[PDB]
Design an enzyme around this catalytic site. Structure first.
Site, mmCIF file in Angstrom:
data_model
loop_
_atom_site.group_PDB
_atom_site.id
_atom_site.type_symbol
_atom_site.label_atom_id
_atom_site.label_comp_id
_atom_site.label_asym_id
_atom_site.label_seq_id
_atom_site.Cartn_x
_atom_site.Cartn_y
_atom_site.Cartn_z
ATOM 1 N N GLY A 17 46.721 33.848 35.057
ATOM 2 C CA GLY A 17 46.792 33.654 36.499
ATOM 3 C C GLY A 17 45.432 33.225 37.028
ATOM 4 O O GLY A 17 45.015 33.618 38.113
ATOM 5 N N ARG A 20 44.059 30.621 40.877
ATOM 6 C CA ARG A 20 43.669 30.874 42.256
ATOM 7 C C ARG A 20 43.313 32.340 42.474
ATOM 8 O O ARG A 20 43.547 33.180 41.607
ATOM 9 C CB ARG A 20 44.846 30.524 43.173
ATOM 10 C CG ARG A 20 46.057 31.409 42.925
ATOM 11 C CD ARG A 20 47.382 30.848 43.464
ATOM 12 N NE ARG A 20 47.990 29.895 42.536
ATOM 13 C CZ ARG A 20 47.724 28.593 42.518
ATOM 14 N NH1 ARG A 20 46.860 28.083 43.387
ATOM 15 N NH2 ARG A 20 48.312 27.801 41.627
ATOM 16 N N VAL A 68 53.947 33.199 32.159
ATOM 17 C CA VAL A 68 54.087 34.530 31.578
ATOM 18 C C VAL A 68 55.476 35.171 31.711
ATOM 19 O O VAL A 68 55.779 36.133 31.013
ATOM 20 C CB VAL A 68 53.022 35.503 32.156
ATOM 21 C CG1 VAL A 68 51.625 34.900 32.029
ATOM 22 C CG2 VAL A 68 53.320 35.807 33.618
ATOM 23 N N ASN A 94 45.961 39.164 34.667
ATOM 24 C CA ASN A 94 46.007 39.037 36.117
ATOM 25 C C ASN A 94 47.264 38.371 36.634
ATOM 26 O O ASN A 94 47.603 38.562 37.799
ATOM 27 C CB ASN A 94 44.755 38.280 36.600
ATOM 28 C CG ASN A 94 44.783 37.955 38.082
ATOM 29 O OD1 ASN A 94 44.570 38.825 38.932
ATOM 30 N ND2 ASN A 94 45.059 36.675 38.411
ATOM 31 N N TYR A 159 57.621 45.315 43.122
ATOM 32 C CA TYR A 159 56.195 45.134 42.834
ATOM 33 C C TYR A 159 55.557 46.466 42.464
ATOM 34 O O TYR A 159 54.839 46.574 41.460
ATOM 35 C CB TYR A 159 55.504 44.532 44.050
ATOM 36 C CG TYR A 159 54.079 44.064 43.786
ATOM 37 C CD1 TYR A 159 53.831 42.957 42.967
ATOM 38 C CD2 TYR A 159 52.991 44.691 44.390
ATOM 39 C CE1 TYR A 159 52.544 42.493 42.766
ATOM 40 C CE2 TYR A 159 51.692 44.225 44.190
ATOM 41 C CZ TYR A 159 51.479 43.130 43.379
ATOM 42 O OH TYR A 159 50.201 42.642 43.157
ATOM 43 N N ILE A 192 43.284 42.113 49.689
ATOM 44 C CA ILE A 192 42.285 41.108 49.353
ATOM 45 C C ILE A 192 42.686 39.780 50.008
ATOM 46 O O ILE A 192 43.826 39.337 49.884
ATOM 47 C CB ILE A 192 42.197 40.890 47.821
ATOM 48 C CG1 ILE A 192 41.981 42.238 47.115
ATOM 49 C CG2 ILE A 192 41.034 39.946 47.491
ATOM 50 C CD1 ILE A 192 40.719 42.999 47.579
#
Lengths: 246, 246, 246, 246
Positions: A17, A20, A68, A94, A159, A192
């Protein structure tokens, strides 16, 4: 006016990942101190972009497209990387996605795709790499989780389940691989940068720091964990969230 | 072949229990990147020793004798330090003791001395310093706890209570001070070198890493938390234990 | 339409801070299934009130005035109780106080009184009682902490430190006493009824359950932990907060 | 000489993996206080066995064969149950498997089967049931995890990942469903009876209680969480392990 992370000699890092955000900043920062940084992104265009950025600064980097969420495809990409590189000393898992929805409304594919992409994938990527780390008696595995994996979150049952799973994976592997000088740790970011302005203000109003974190801040933590002097930190979850959830 | 921790410009650090072990290595390592490191030890002889070691490397350091278990005495030492220094940007609360005993046999003074030295002391040392950090809108407070503060330990009901208390202190202060660019975090070391050889072997046999950690490893983590780029890590407990207790 | 908690035969329970709120409901509910419930309150008037309430329902109860913040005084009260009762099978350490203030404004006595009352007191009360439990090979020690002991809270650095300390105490004692059929656990309540209406609404708006908890709900959890069938639950912290902080 | 758990009036419970061990004891104990207990086991023979045992005591029970690792199959079983029963007030997600192996040796199917059976299954079983609980404004969802989901374990990277995932699921759903009077909690058992005698002795030597727990002890905790008076406990993980891992 920045930290320097000594990660050892002749080291190779691999960041998934990497196209970005956090993944991209981690790959770029690791490049300052490892001999070669391999970037994996879903599309070849995405990783070429970050590999070019890293190379423009005089560092060594290569990129491989790899989804992935497709076990056969990502397994082949990792096998290819390991035929080209004897060792991958630092692995940053990631890659991940969100498919948000209240549990009542969530679709079966939203549940499945998030678990498959964020959790099942760890096996196919980490197993072959860990075999080389065990043989070489050295490794740094950093799994990106999320504060949601620790606290749960409305609209993110999928998630949260996946990111909590990342933590259970992390702790088990730390127990199994530590004797071979391999550390396995997770980073759980809060909010973030990179949502409506009103919801964003609502979020920020819940963060003691009074702002969202930056991908560069997360990268600093990942590079610290990848460094030579962090060999006694193992099986932990490091939260970087500005005090959102002590 | 070491990490470099940029901690900002013209910074002053203060480390308690700086005379030996973890405290000593933290003060020595911080000296590589802060303008002045103040060392506090129970005796003037102890801090002069570390201050001399730091100065022998070309760095700036000063030392004050101060018994953290005596509130009036330590309060005066801190007041003196703050009359000499406008700001103390980094505070490492490392002073602490153990007075081990099974709960059934533990003496009232063993209970009291450990709580007073390890926990009550934080108020007298941290309050005046935090006032200056708030006014200056900058700070790094690192409290040394212990894995025993998270898991408890046979023979250490007093130590565990005190070190768990350090964690509750840490999280509350993080919530109150984060808006002023002050981070408050704790480090919970596992078994750090510096016990019978048989008991030591028994301990090491329970550590996945297969060895005890070093005070230099703990110092690396403290300096990372003291650095400029760790400003979004707040209210956390970072365990450095070789995988002893995931 | 209520649960029944079988706590064993001929059992004696002791609840501190039994004069009001959670402590009072715990003593009253335990009375439904233990042979004798001893109530300790700061004043004799306070415990007589709850002892009378318990007796009015046909149960056995006695009360002793005892200020847990005064070590000599509370130590004598406990000694007296143990001369009158061979065994105290269930101990609920509920006594505690708050002296709220932002850390910057907090007075030394606000810090000291809260730590002394809420944490140091546990030694003087629990040590003599645990000696009898070890000799009798049976016990239930339930320590009331707070969610603030786990998460910290603005304006409560002292309370949070004390309640986190209660948790470290709990875990260490569980490790030492479990082989003698003694369980040691903590209950961490969230917002329990018994503040401005606006702040209360603000709080409730943060609780998924949409309301504050009741002292009777906390008592149910304490009686469950005191029961015969909860002997394998040891060294844990059970949070009862309506989902406030998963 | 046992506890009685009042779970409300006219309640229907559903327990998966009810054919043996913990699941079987949970279904049997719930039967003492709910109007009807539905048992799901992989084979019809297995659930008929427990349904017969429950009925032999004068209680109401029914059984449905259902393999939770097959999404289409288990989704149809749950749909059938919901056409027969308007409400399922208590759901105990206990079905689960282990496929142990060191990570280096683990097969892709061992990884996949454990995640699919233990984690992905929760969506197909819980979503339809939670819809009815929301409409009825009442529910108790108890997810069986494991201490391994909290600490990780050598040889169980797959199991640990799955059981940690169960916890992330639990916390997210608690946040979403609490306003509808639905609690969502997890139970994390340690070593429960039902391995070489030497390894078993090795394990027991690490448990402060000095013995393994019983499925009846776990059932007591599940019935307490299913009771009427546990409505303020939400989004938590309750560990029952004899002090193995505080």
């Amino acid at each position: 006016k920045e930290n320097y992370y000594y990660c050892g000699e002749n080291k190779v890092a691999l960041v998934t990942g990497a196209g970005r955000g956090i993944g991209r900043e981690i790959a770029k920062m690791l490049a300052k101190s490892v001999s070669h940084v391999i970037c994996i992104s879903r599309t070849q265009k995405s990783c070429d972009s970050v590999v070019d950025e890293i190379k423009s600064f005089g560092y060594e980097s290569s990129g491989y497209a790899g989804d992935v969420s497709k076990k056969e495809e990502i397994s082949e990409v990792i096998n290819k990387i390991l035929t080209e590189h004897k060792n991958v000393d630092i692995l940053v898992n990631n890659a991940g996605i969100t498919r948000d929805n209240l549990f009542l409304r969530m679709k079966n594919d939203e549940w499945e795709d998030v678990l498959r992409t964020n959790l099942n994938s760890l096996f196919y990527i980490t197993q072959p790499i860990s075999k080389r780390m065990i043989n070489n008696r050295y490794g740094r595995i950093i799994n990106i989780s999320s504060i949601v994996g620790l606290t749960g979150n409305v609209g993110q049952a999928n998630y949260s389940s996946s990111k909590a799973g990342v933590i259970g994976f992390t702790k088990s592997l730390a127990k199994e691989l530590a004797s071979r000088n391999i550390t396995v740790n997770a980073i759980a970011p809060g909010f973030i940068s990179s949502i409506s302005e009103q919801i964003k203000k609502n979020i920020i109003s819940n963060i003691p720091a009074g702002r969202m974190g930056t991908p560069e801040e997360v990268a600093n933590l990942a590079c610290f964990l990848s460094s030579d002097k962090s060999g006694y930190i193992n099986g932990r979850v490091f939260v970087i969230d500005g005090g959102l959830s002590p």
